[PDB]
Coordinates of C-alpha atoms in Angstrom, one line a residue:
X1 CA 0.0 0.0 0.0
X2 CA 2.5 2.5 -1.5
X3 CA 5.9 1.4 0.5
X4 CA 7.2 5.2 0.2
X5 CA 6.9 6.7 4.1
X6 CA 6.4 3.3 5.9
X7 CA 2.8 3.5 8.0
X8 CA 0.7 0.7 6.5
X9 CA 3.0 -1.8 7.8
X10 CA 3.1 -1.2 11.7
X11 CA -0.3 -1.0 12.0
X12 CA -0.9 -3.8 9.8
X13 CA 0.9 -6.1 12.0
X14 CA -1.2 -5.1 15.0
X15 CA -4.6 -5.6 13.0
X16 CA -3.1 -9.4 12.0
X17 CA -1.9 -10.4 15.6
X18 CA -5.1 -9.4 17.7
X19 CA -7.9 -10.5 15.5
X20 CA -8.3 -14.3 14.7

């Protein structure tokens, strides 16, 4: 999701590990 100032990638992390 655009890999230019790295912020959809912590985030989507956390969403992954505390949800199923």
């Amino acid at each position: 999701k655009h890999v230019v100032p790295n912020e959809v990638v912590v985030q989507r992390l956390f969403q992954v590990k505390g949800r199923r």
